[PDB]
Amino acid sequence: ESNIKVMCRFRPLNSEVNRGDKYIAKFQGEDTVVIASKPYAFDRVFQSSTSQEQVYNDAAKKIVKDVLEGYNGTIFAYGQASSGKTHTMEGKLHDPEGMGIIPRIVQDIFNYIYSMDENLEFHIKVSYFEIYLDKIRDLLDVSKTNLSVHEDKNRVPYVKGATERFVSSPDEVMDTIDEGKSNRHVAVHSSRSHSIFLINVKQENTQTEQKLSGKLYLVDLAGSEKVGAVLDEAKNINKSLSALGNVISALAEGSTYVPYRDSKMTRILQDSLGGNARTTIVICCSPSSYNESETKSTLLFGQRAKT
């Protein structure tokens, strides 16, 4: 019903072994992981050996194909520091085996476009903003610090004043990602804000003249903090995570009312999370004994989306 799939990735272990740490995690097949004799069931659990490409294949690929066919979708990344969130989501820029989910999404989009030359015409608009201290901040125009979410006549959400930049190649998309990353709020390199990257795929069919439109959101979630300006960061981070969790949970349990309005991120993502929309949540975990509570913390958060 809900269309949310939660997938958990554990990374290989070192470099770190010199500390003295154990593996702490056992896998009952490919969808369940056991820690401290407690079982956590998911839709897929990627073990240490799982390649970048099959993470993309199982987590994101069908979502991309759906957006190229007119649907909306969302992929979330969630993880405590050094869990492998960045390796999973971005990976190694121009190494194909190699690269993480976001570069593979972009390559599939453009290969499809190239393979569909004349018969389909495309316009890809990308936007990039972060939820920092409950404020919507544009990562492509530092002057736009405090933007708002609204709904149109059809109850379709949009962020007012957000930069939309036209892109025509994979490099142009990646250039845009790097520009936004430069302005993203970091501390201690923890992300202190949640960042949302939007690819809007607009197409028109040359034979039939009919139009299609699809929105793919890539959300990098800041991890929950247990702790001045860094305190306001923690309470906002945590409150917005609980708002997401409430939505995500109401959809998973089939609630007829879903509390999208209780936070800005979920208002933005209302046309792309729940309903017809396709969603994958990738939670990244360290296997080390040193981080067992963090992992167990991440795992519980992932559990909220699990029917």
Domain layout of the chain by residue ranges: 1-307
| Strand segments (E) across 36-94 | 38-41, 44-46, 73-78
Q: Would you say 245 and 42 are in contact if contact means Cβ atoms under 8 Å apart?
A: no
Closest CA to 4 of 300, 298, 276, 295: 276
Region of residue 36 (phi > 0: left; psi between -120 and 50: alpha; otherwise: beta): left
Contacts of 154 (CB under 8 A, 6+ apart): none
The span from the CA of 282 to the CA of 63, in Å, is 13
Name the experimental technique: X-ray
Task: Return all residues near 199 (Cβ < 8 A) that are at least 6 apart.
Answer: 67, 105, 106, 109, 124, 125, 126, 173, 215, 216, 218
Both structure tokens of 208: 């039939």
Tell me the C-alpha distance between 6 and 304, whole Å.
Answer: 9
* Protein fold of 1-307: Kinesin (3.40.850)
Token duo for residue 181? 């990353």
**Final resolution, Å:** 2.6
